[PDB]
RNA sequence: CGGCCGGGAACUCAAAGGAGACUGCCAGUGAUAAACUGGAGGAAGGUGGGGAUGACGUCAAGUCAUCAUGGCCCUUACGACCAGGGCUACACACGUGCUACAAUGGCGCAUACAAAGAGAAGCGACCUCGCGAGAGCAAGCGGACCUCAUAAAGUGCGUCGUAGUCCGGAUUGGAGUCUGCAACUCGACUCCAUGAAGUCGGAAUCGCUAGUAAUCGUGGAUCAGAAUGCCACGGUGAAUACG
């Protein structure tokens, strides 16, 4: 059967927005398209940048960009030169001022964007989806992740019939709204086609709600 | 003199009742009883609290109804009456509640679903 | 209910008379929620009924009652792949609804041109045993004491 | 003088109270008196989507968006209190409307 | 149909087409596109070869014809049975 | 009773009865009737032959009975004449008002004729 | 959908755009009951020359990611697709699954 | 004589935070039990009602026409622009719905009670004209304020008196309104005129366990206009379950 996308359902009880600003019906879908152009553009920009997330608000007449990494350093660039030209490319592209602040990850292995990415990474570098994934769970479980499953389907080694394949470590309650999901997604193009990968990431459950 | 309360509630019916001792006068939103309620039905379930209890014609009800329909807004009022009663005498607990008047019906109107026609009614099926 | 547990509902009686035999008969007139219209009907017919004979209201609806009540019906029970209409007495609740059921089915199916007249008429025929669901009462007795062997 | 309406709508109720909170303590700070927030109807906005990419007309999705509104209302305004609110910076995600009169 | 207080729709070109072919006594069919446009008292008398989306359909406009449309004298659809 | 050259029905009210009239419906019976300061409960035959001779003149003030059948022919033969789209359909005796013709024309075709 | 018709309505967009105000004034005089017969005409004819596309009818609103002309809505400018990959990714401000 | 206006935080209500219901208590049954049944208290009693939530997998299920994509094919054409036409055809078959066949009703007069929504290239009041759809001027309203917006069924009085009818409204003719560059193919609505079939439906078959079925209206998305569909909201409100 089809399950719910675990961000989607935990909105607003465990898991906050990633765009957390208030419009009426008349620029709501301008700032919709905007908000979607600037992360477009970001990821395009930091693919190499190990960017996990982009937190955009709209704070009366500005724009700021929130870009969580694992690579705050390779993000800002020499003095912040490289933040300085994101921030007028942002801004250029929002047709409002623009301010860019960077929250580093120190944990990318329990990051289920980062780990899917690396996964996606391995296998486009022809790297045994098997071992890939392998490798990614005892990583997580290593540092520290209460539990994970990682999935990778999709004509896995250049074969005919397509597959999908998951392992998973320790637990992951899904149907808990409470539980502390970290869940992404992700696509590697081979020379064979996609093959998409999922990362789920339990971290614990919290009982306060918090939002 | 006190004017003893009760709210009662029906459906989407809410009711005030203000309840002061006196004649048998009932003026329920500034008329009548019959005049609010044609319906002999629903002029004998306001009329029901006070008929079990010895205290038809001694007190004075003021009566206010919004929402809901006649058979809501009569329970509504006969919740309030009950409720404003027990206010005023405390021993009349035991009879009313017995006379199921104390519970709030709570049965609500279930709302419609997707690929229902109604709140259970589902569309017409055939094998062939 | 293959799990069971399932009980009979609470009704409430009327307001003129306080009856739970008129309630029900009220309830199983009633067409479409219309509860107003099938309470006047039903209190027009007993006004009328109790021009005709003068004992009372409740206790004529009652006497049409006791004429129109089966004491025994016919389930189906297959046995040899085919079916034998095995005779069950009715227990007395099941008794009152098909009775009541029967009277307002048999009052639709009238001549008459109103309703509550066309209910005066078919009460008066069950409580002096010459109506459709006199008629249909003796049916199934007929039938039940022909399969009586089954 | 004329009392001064805030209209505060937002998104998540938490910090729509939050904001009011701010404004009401700092409004109680400086000076005036507030009669407000009073909790105004929220609005409920509901979409209901088809799910799966070509058929399937039964599989749906709702969402709703809930705008909550508070609304503050500051009577004698001193001098300080109207520039005070006006620099009381309030969080991000919170429109804030004034109106004066 | 048209509001009155609007008037009856005509298209400029057929307009500037048919003013042409009566002050010149052109009897060659106006070839024309425009079936939305309406038949005015001074087409009376004149060839049009009106489009049916393959071909263009010529119609003799008489004096009967006014008020209706083009298109309502040159059919669309091609049917002769099922059979 | 004998109204533009048929029998009014006796026993109904005036308005119904004037209703039988071919060309005359409830609203303009009414409008007849108020013409002719006529109640319209009134049964037909409780009027005076003054009466019937003011509702003659009424509906002679109309186009009815055979005049306006005779009206409505020439108009379906002119379209039918005129070879217009709306003349096609009456020739053909398919519904002339855009309904679907791939099912609900019955009332136009007739009963159903099976292959 | 394809870049052609993508490049429809941004054209069509403009061309409205660009001729707003000869359209409502031609069909404000058309409306008019205090206006001349030979003017009412005359804009009748202008406004039947004016160019097609200029007319902000003939504009279908298309999801502004993928320009699929079905299941449009208005509040977010996307189909039904995109607005549920935006909504449970978390990017729609507000917006959350709905019981009650 | 209008919460209307001084005025009051009593009450409905609006949201925000909490309390409460757990077989907790009592009795019986039960296997020294889990649990079940009944009773008290209680607004609620045994998951209180409803929703969201869809395990490992099956159907090489559906979607290359949302999108992305491996391959294959076209490149003065399988690409692109335009006008008209078609997707609305019509001997027929099937599926899903609406309206009826009437008196528990039709028509006329008087009068009563909702909830949830939408609104700025928008909702549009009052007033005047039109029988009506609507038109003219135009206040207010980014809206617990202003508009959509009079709920209908119901109640009371009268008539119709079992008819193919004062049932039913299909179909068709004439005249119009509005949207729109433009209603012929091919819109919606109004007025007048006509008044088909239809008198409860064969084998067979479907939905429904309580505020449910049945019935009555209202709103919204899409939308210049165009719902009998879809999605929501409330009003009246059952029969039965032995097994
Ligand atoms: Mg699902
Ligand atoms: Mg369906
Ligand atoms: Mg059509
Ligand atoms: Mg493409
Ligand atoms: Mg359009
Ligand atoms: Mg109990
Ligand atoms: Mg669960
Ligand atoms: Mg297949
Ligand atoms: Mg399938
Ligand atoms: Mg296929
Ligand atoms: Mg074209
Ligand atoms: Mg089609
Ligand atoms: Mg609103
Ligand atoms: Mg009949
Ligand atoms: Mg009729
Ligand atoms: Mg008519
Ligand atoms: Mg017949
Ligand atoms: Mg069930
Ligand atoms: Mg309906
Ligand atoms: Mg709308
Ligand atoms: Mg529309
Ligand atoms: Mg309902």
Known sequence: ?????????????VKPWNSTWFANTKEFADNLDSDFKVRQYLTKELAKASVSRIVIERPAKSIRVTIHTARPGIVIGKKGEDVEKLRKVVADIAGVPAQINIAEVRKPELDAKLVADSITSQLERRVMFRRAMKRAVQNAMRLGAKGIKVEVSGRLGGAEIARTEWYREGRVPLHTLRADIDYN??????????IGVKVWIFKGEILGGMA | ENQYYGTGRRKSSAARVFIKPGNGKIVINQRSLEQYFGRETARMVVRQPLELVDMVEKLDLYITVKGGGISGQAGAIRHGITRALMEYDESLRSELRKAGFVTRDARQVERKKVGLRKARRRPQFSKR | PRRRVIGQRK???????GSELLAKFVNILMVDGKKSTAESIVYSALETLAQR????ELEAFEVALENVRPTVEVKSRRVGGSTYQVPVEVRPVRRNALAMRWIVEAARKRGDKSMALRL?????????????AVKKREDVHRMAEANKAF | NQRIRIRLKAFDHRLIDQATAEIVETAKRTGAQVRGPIPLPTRKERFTVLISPHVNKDARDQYEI????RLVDIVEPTEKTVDALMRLDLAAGVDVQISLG | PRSLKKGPFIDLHLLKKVEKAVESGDKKPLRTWSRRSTIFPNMIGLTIAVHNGRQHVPVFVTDEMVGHKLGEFAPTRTYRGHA | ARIAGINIPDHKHAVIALTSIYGVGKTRSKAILAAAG???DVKISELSEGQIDTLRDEVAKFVVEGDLRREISMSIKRLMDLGCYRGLR???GLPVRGQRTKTNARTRKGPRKPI | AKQSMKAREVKRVALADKYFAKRAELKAIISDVNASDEDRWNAVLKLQTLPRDSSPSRQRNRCRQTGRPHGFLRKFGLSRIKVREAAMRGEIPGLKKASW
């Open chain 1, 1 to 13: 059967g089809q399950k719910v996308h675990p961000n989607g359902i935990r909105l607003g009880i």
């Open chain 1, 185 to 194: 997604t992700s696509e590697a193009h081979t020379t064979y086609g996609v």
């Open chain 3, 11 to 17: 009704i409430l009686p009327d307001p003129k008379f």
């Open chain 3, 53 to 56: 004979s003068g004992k009372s």
């Open chain 3, 120 to 132: 005066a008429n078919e009460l008066s025929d069950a409580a002096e045993n010459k109506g459709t």
């Open chain 4, 66 to 69: 809930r705008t909550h509104l």
């Open chain 6, 38 to 40: 006529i109640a319209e």
């Open chain 6, 90 to 92: 009456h020739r053909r």
